Design an enzyme around this catalytic site. Structure first.
Site, short mmCIF file in Angstrom:
data_model
loop_
_atom_site.label_atom_id
_atom_site.label_comp_id
_atom_site.label_asym_id
_atom_site.label_seq_id
_atom_site.Cartn_x
_atom_site.Cartn_y
_atom_site.Cartn_z
N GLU A 45 0.58 -0.68 -0.11
CA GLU A 45 -0.23 0.08 -0.02
C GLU A 45 0.58 1.08 -0.11
O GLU A 45 0.53 2.33 -0.58
CB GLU A 45 -0.84 0.05 0.78
CG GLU A 45 -2.13 -1.67 1.59
CD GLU A 45 -2.97 -0.49 0.95
OE1 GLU A 45 -3.17 -0.14 -0.67
OE2 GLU A 45 -3.73 -1.70 -0.26
N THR A 71 -8.40 5.90 3.39
CA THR A 71 -9.26 6.30 1.45
C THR A 71 -11.25 6.38 2.50
O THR A 71 -11.55 5.24 2.10
CB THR A 71 -9.24 5.73 0.41
OG1 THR A 71 -8.19 5.71 0.24
CG2 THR A 71 -10.09 6.33 -0.41
N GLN A 106 -13.11 -1.10 9.76
CA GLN A 106 -13.26 -1.54 8.85
C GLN A 106 -13.28 -2.40 8.30
O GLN A 106 -13.10 -2.64 6.68
CB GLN A 106 -11.61 -1.04 8.86
CG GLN A 106 -10.91 -0.74 7.40
CD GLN A 106 -11.51 0.32 6.74
OE1 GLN A 106 -11.48 1.06 6.37
NE2 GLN A 106 -11.06 -0.48 5.46
N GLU A 137 -8.26 -5.02 3.48
CA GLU A 137 -8.38 -3.50 1.69
C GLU A 137 -9.45 -4.08 1.03
O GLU A 137 -10.09 -2.39 0.56
CB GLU A 137 -7.18 -3.77 1.20
CG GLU A 137 -6.29 -3.23 2.48
CD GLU A 137 -6.20 -1.82 2.25
OE1 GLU A 137 -5.08 -1.62 2.74
OE2 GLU A 137 -6.97 -1.16 1.90
N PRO A 139 -9.48 -4.69 -2.28
CA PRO A 139 -8.98 -4.06 -3.46
C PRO A 139 -9.43 -4.49 -4.70
O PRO A 139 -10.31 -5.31 -4.87
CB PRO A 139 -7.18 -4.54 -3.53
CG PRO A 139 -7.49 -5.95 -3.41
CD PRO A 139 -8.52 -6.12 -2.21
N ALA A 140 -10.06 -3.82 -5.54
CA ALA A 140 -10.79 -4.01 -7.23
C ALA A 140 -10.31 -4.64 -7.54
O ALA A 140 -10.63 -5.98 -8.66
CB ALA A 140 -10.76 -2.18 -7.71
N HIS A 182 15.53 -26.45 54.13
CA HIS A 182 14.74 -26.97 52.43
C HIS A 182 13.39 -28.10 52.76
O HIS A 182 13.12 -28.90 51.49
CB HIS A 182 15.76 -26.89 51.37
CG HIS A 182 15.93 -25.96 51.26
ND1 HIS A 182 18.11 -25.50 50.54
CD2 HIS A 182 16.61 -24.91 51.09
CE1 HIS A 182 18.32 -25.42 50.67
NE2 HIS A 182 17.95 -23.73 51.50
N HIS A 270 21.30 -18.66 48.18
CA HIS A 270 19.89 -19.69 47.95
C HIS A 270 19.26 -18.90 47.48
O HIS A 270 18.73 -17.84 46.51
CB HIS A 270 19.08 -19.23 49.84
CG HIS A 270 17.18 -19.76 49.44
ND1 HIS A 270 17.20 -21.51 50.85
CD2 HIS A 270 16.38 -19.44 49.27
CE1 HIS A 270 16.11 -21.26 50.61
NE2 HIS A 270 14.85 -20.31 49.61
ZN LIG Z 1 18.49 -22.58 51.88
#
Ligand SMILES: [Zn+2]
Length: 324
Positions: A45, A71, A106, A137, A139-140, A182, A270
């Site tokens: 375009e 347009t 559109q 678009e 288009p034609a 942990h 850690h």
């Molecule tokens: Zn730890």
């Protein structure tokens, strides 16, 4: 940087514009495919030029203007004025397209796809360029396969990081489910070659929480990353024990930047990582770790160029993934 003018852009100039549009609409939730499908169209375009008037006819508002050649131009230009945006401007034009998606404007559904569907599509950039052509678009002359070829070219030519283990060495003083502190967790305490030993950003990330009391910073990857186990996901982690804390909430690091040091905030680091882009504070189960879904550090982070001294018999993996 964008190129904005009433003149046809070279491929070099278009590439700059095409990259900018990709970055912008990516943050707005469009897929790379759909953006490229649109780019293929805007290349035909306008040579992806937000300042371009149809046939170079400056000021003729009855004819096309800008990236998709609105347009008559006045429909866009008038929308821009009503929105308090300067009309001859990349961002203003992108804002117009977003608006069209958001306001059922559109687009006409001639290919069994709505505009909202289009921007989330992962069909080929070729497929989508042709859907865009027919639907937006209109288009034609409908026989323009070059828009498809151009789409696929921008897909290949525009724009995952592998999560790298932060430290040079793996030497574990307490592993997952470790007896001292942990139990119930996938945390691991690592020591360096010396006290206060440096470690680095596993990927582009941002600091999302700071706990001064407990001496931790929390970080979230900016994008989805490629993991050592071949998984693609966002990740979030915590580094504990550095003293003093290096950064503040909001801090941005690129992959490989200094992220922290071991410490006494026995000297160690850690580390704990969870799935996703959401930091959720902590829990005890019975021992303390991040709330959320804990992942194995050795499945998330690759150990390319790491000296393994202990080890703990985990499946540490190297990865051949090449970073974009
Ligand atoms: Zn730890």
């Amino acid at each position: 940087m964008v190129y904005v003018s009433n003149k046809y852009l070279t491929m070099s100039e278009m590439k700059v514009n095409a990259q900018y549009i990709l970055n912008y609409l990516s943050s707005n939730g469009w897929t790379k495919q759909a953006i490229c499908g649109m780019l293929g169209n805007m290349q035909s375009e306008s040579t992806i030029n937000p300042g371009l008037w149809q046939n170079l006819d400056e000021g003729n508002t009855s004819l096309g203007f800008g990236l998709v050649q609105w347009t008559p131009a006045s429909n866009y230009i008038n929308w821009a004025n009503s929105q308090g945006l300067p009309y001859k401007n990349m961002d203003s034009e992108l804002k117009r397209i977003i608006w069209e998606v958001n306001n059922n404007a559109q687009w006409i559904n001639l290919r069994d796809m709505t505009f909202k569907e289009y921007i989330k599509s992962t069909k080929t950039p070729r497929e989508l360029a042709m859907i865009f052509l027919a639907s937006y678009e209109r288009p034609a002359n409908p026989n323009q396969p070059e828009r498809g070829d151009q789409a696929e070219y921008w897909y290949k030519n525009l724009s995952l990081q592998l999560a790298q283990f932060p430290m040079d060495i793996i030497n574990i003083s307490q592993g997952e489910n470790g007896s001292f502190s942990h139990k119930g967790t996938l945390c691991i305490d690592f020591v360096g070659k010396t006290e206060k030993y440096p470690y680095y950003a596993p990927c582009d990330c941002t600091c999302v929480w700071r706990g001064d009391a407990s001496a931790y910073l929390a970080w979230t990857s900016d994008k989805e990353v490629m993991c050592a186990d071949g998984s693609v996901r966002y990740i979030t982690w915590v580094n504990v024990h550095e003293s003093p804390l290096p950064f503040d909430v909001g801090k941005k690091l690129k992959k490989g930047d200094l992220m922290g040091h071991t410490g006494i905030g026995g000297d160690h680091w850690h580390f704990n990582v969870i799935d996703g882009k959401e930091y959720q504070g902590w829990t005890k189960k019975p021992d303390s770790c991040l709330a959320g879904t804990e992942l194995h550090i050795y499945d998330v982070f690759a150990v390319n160029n790491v000296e393994i001294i202990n080890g703990n018999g985990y499946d540490w993996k190297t990865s051949d993934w090449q970073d974009g």
